[PDB]
Design a protein around this ligand. Structure first.
Ligand code: KHL
Ligand code: KHL
Ligand code: KHL
Ligand code: KHL
Lengths: 261, 261, 261, 261
């Protein structure tokens, strides 16, 4: 159907994109980057992230495919040499779609802004000390003092979540995971420490205690928010759809990226 | 209906059991510890664990209730002073049942033995070095060298799993979580490090590399197994049912047990 | 001899300062905040830190004493009710001095600036990704990718170092300790992970790989540095001297601050 | 002078030993495994550990050298191909000696046994729960509940200590480091969590609370001790001496063993 291709912008990725476009010209494939049904990302995981946010308002109409030009990307699971075979299989169709959960961040002021994340959503202070009350389904759970917090999707658990001590979570689990960044823990201040895994329909809310300015980052897009009254986290109802042409299981993907390949 | 009561065995718990029995005599409640429909545990989490394994062959016919005589137990969420009010509400009935996932361990030899866990199932070596290949859905994932491994249920994540760096997982998530015990990690030997969370129908298998003798512990019941060929982990199809009479959410339970109460 | 007193600035601390000054008027004690020999800090650990940096150019001529107005501070080990007994013992003299090691940070450009730390010296990126080569005594040790790094004094190991997984180190050990902040670790990027403890005369140097702008914080005083060519860490030759009037051992101080008091 | 050579016992190591002996026959070198002045270990770190304990009663009269037949050992820093050049340099002499601190474990009963460790000394329970009071210089510091504890030398910090979260410590620092094994931490039971680094002349003592049987392991030599009244740890006055023929710094050794080589 309709398709488009984003590139990292370097020489290698642009040429691959041009060759794939020329290969798509030899089928009934129309290039359309306004209402594509197939979005192809050529680059790394960052490039795939940019492609996701570029089309986040049409997630139900789009299937994503990643090609990695450098080393294996977690979302870009195709080597450049397989691009010709990918063009052919994609042209025919009859591929199966695979869906991963997403995370919804809502920021309220004193107005409401919402964001969608594929990796994670983190919160820090705008300079001063970060102090927030953590409220789970309207129950006050803890007062957090430290560098910040990170709320991860399942496919995000192998990213920033992993470096903060979080657990790696299979993407068929509709959940989100909260991890701490350097929390204070003494006789006066104490947090849970452990990562927390939340199911669908649970709401985690952050409430300022003193400072109301926070730096919020959704998939490394970092925005300063002033006069913040609440940050709410929940598993989104929207999902990202991947076009898959062969078996590449998640735990094998994890093995290749972290153990050996 | 039919019911029975287990006690920690100390003076305080025995007297509470006797008083509850006398209180049950004033209703249409028959004491039966062969085919009870209600099992009451008076003691700590250990006592509740013993009650679970005592009746693990009738989990679908039984609802559990825990009373804690010492401090708050995670499974024993009733104070002794509320025992009279518990007798009354239980006598009427019309309570709602709450189900938690369980973990199935299978041990093969050179014959098959299976176990059911409510907290976790761990594996260590019988003295020599512990070395196992970790296989996920028939895919070889890693070779583990270290002290041992721990596979946790959701309600178990606040137990041994928590002390090994695992994530705390809400019990409505049908999953199991694998955590490492002091793994070797240098240029020659390397593991994933991070905890792993597996959904229903995923099978994690441990395969010996050299030594075939392992000490396997299911809910602190520790058994030596010789001539072991495989240990398989998967989320059980069986579930434990709790009788609940009021709202005591999991994250509030976690807050009380770890933050403050 | 000569003395001065810094206060947190709230009502409670100002009144305590005024009362101690009036008590010092009844001895041969001259108030002098230009060349004091005794510096008294009334507040928390932050107030003590400010007092240290206010007089860092006369460390060999000054002994410090901390009074904590809120909860126990690690450096402020005197309760306000003991202020009168402290005035008396200090007026007589014949107290013993205790010395803690300090950390020297040197920043080079493309010029040289040096800083002295009592808790720690940390480095982050000015927004972009933080990537530095870590060089130990002119040996290239690792390339670090992550949120940042923290170099701690011994008395600092119970502060930020503690929240990043570092070890707690007795202050009689002339050393410094380096800990990571959320490092990337996969098949392509890998760091040591473990904290590193360095003796006197060892030099740890950070060298930029791409971005040359870093946010450097010495005892929570955070400064942006542009066009950075090198950050060098080493145990200082200067030491801070505490006046002590009774036995309050470090591990007891640690017990009171973290286990129970 | 006098010398002897221990081998791992496999074919490769025995032949190397025989060739080195024949090479030593061509100098004024007498083979003597009763009172050697030079001890050569051919194998891995385990083989070097066995050589250390074989001659622990003559540490001041002996210099050690390790040759690694498999991958790089931390104590065995010579490749087999350099054995001929090692024979020659050792025959001449005029080499410089390098000393590493050691750890002294003392076990008291209801009699006294002492052990010397080069890597570490650990303590576990003989089956039941491990519960000990931790006393630092006669000050009660904490009650530990968990799997066990590990007290490490500096050169041991890259071994078991590393896998338990401890810090890596340069061997010129006369110290010992204590790390936890899976400690219980909730509202009722709490430990320090962080590793602890102790200087020379500090004494750490473990005192049983209930069970008095402990499994104590000194450099992987594991002994059951019954009727235990106290386990005392302190930096030994004895030191191990290494013969060094060229610069191979500790942090380079660490880089090669963990980052890349
Ligand atoms: N302190 C920290 N430690 C560890 N990770 C941290 C971190 N701070 C942020 N992040 C993670 O970077 C994401 C944003 N960036 C693109 C990516 C993607 C990714 N997504 C996944 C996934 N789902 N699973 C497995 N690997 C994944 N990756 C892998 O990360 C490696 C690069 N990481 C870097 O940090 N660069 C420096 C700053 N970031 C960027 O400029 C752009 C690449 O190898 C890439 O392939 C965020 O969304 C965070 O998650
Ligand atoms: N090194 C280690 N560190 C941390 N935990 C470890 C551990 N080794 C094993 N275990 C856990 O003990 C369970 C078995 N025992 C009864 C319990 C239950 C429990 N279940 C839950 C739950 N689901 N959620 C939250 N808290 C829970 N608890 C809390 O543990 C505290 C006691 N722990 C102890 O270890 N005693 C010493 C040895 N064990 C026993 O004799 C009996 C009590 O406070 C009890 O209330 C196992 O199944 C493991 O999980
Ligand atoms: N993410 C993080 N997690 C943990 N600590 C972090 C951190 N970021 C920074 N720091 C540490 O704060 C120091 C600077 N601040 C005064 C202090 C002193 C201190 N010194 C010691 C010591 N030597 N030993 C034991 N406790 C000590 N304390 C204890 O820290 C508690 C407050 N901590 C806070 O963070 N406030 C928010 C930001 N900071 C400030 O505004 C002022 C007080 O209880 C105080 O008594 C820095 O130098 C860092 O070390
Ligand atoms: N759960 C655990 N996780 C991590 N380490 C653990 C551990 N349990 C115990 N140990 C450490 O094994 C030592 C005893 N063994 C010889 C060694 C030496 C060593 N010494 C050093 C040093 N100073 N610095 C850096 N590396 C060093 N090594 C490296 O350890 C690798 C093997 N480790 C193994 O465990 N084998 C299984 C059991 N042990 C043995 O049969 C024999 C080899 O690569 C060897 O070269 C102990 O003394 C402990 O320290």
């Amino acid at each position: 159907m309709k398709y488009m291709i984003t590139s990292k912008g370097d020489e290698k990725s642009d040429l691959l994109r041009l060759n794939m476009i020329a290969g798509f010209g030899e089928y009934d494939m129309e290039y359309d980057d306004v209402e594509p049904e197939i979005v192809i990302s050529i680059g790394g995981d960052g490039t795939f992230l940019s492609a996701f946010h570029q089309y986040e308002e049409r997630l139900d109409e789009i299937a994503f495919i990643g090609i990695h030009t450098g080393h294996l990307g977690f979302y870009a699971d195709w080597r450049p040499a397989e691009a010709d075979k990918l063009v052919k299989l994609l042209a025919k169709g009859e591929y199966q779609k695979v869906s991963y959960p997403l995370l919804k961040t809502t920021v309220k002021y004193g107005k409401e802004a919402t964001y969608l994340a594929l990796n994670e959503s983190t919160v820090k202070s705008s300079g001063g000390p970060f102090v927030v009350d953590v409220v789970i389904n309207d129950i006050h759970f803890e007062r957090f003092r430290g560098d910040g917090l990170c709320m991860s999707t399942p496919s995000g658990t192998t990213a920033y979540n992993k470096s903060l001590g979080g657990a790696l979570m299979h993407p068929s689990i509709e959940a989100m995971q909260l991890t701490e960044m350097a929390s204070i823990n003494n006789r006066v201040y104490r947090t849970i420490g452990s990562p927390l895994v939340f199911p669908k329909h649970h709401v985690v809310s952050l409430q300022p205690v003193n400072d109301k300015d926070f730096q919020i980052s959704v998939d490394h897009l970092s925005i300063l928010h002033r006069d913040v009254q609440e940050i709410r986290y929940e598993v989104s109802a929207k999902k990202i759809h991947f076009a898959r042409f062969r078996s590449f299981p998640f735990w094998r993907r994890v093995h290749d990226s972290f153990i050996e390949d």
